[PDB]
């Protein structure tokens, strides 16, 4: 079948592709974004001081 979602176990929720969905904080404060670029669910960390 084709693989364009993204499963994320961190909440088990599935996003679309291209499809940008912000993930709760570890323990410090920064917010968890992680993004769809094709079905591997990419993702990075941006705090919220800027």
Same mark, same amino acid.
Request: charged content about 20%; proline content about 4%; hydrophobic content about 25%.
């Given at each position: 079948?084709?693989? &364009?979602?993204? +499963?994320?176990? *961190?909440? /088990?929720?599935? @996003? /679309? /592709? =291209?499809? %940008?969905?912000?993930? #709760? &904080?570890? +323990? %410090? !404060?920064? &917010?968890? @974004?992680?993004?769809? !670029? $094709?079905?591997?669910?990419?993702? =990075? $960390?941006? #705090? &919220? *001081? $800027?």
């Amino acid at each position: 079948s084709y693989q &364009v979602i993204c +499963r994320d176990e *961190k909440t /088990q929720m599935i @996003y /679309q /592709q =291209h499809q %940008s969905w912000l993930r #709760p &904080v570890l +323990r %410090s !404060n920064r &917010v968890e @974004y992680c993004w769809c !670029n $094709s079905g591997r669910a990419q993702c =990075h $960390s941006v #705090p &919220v *001081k $800027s």
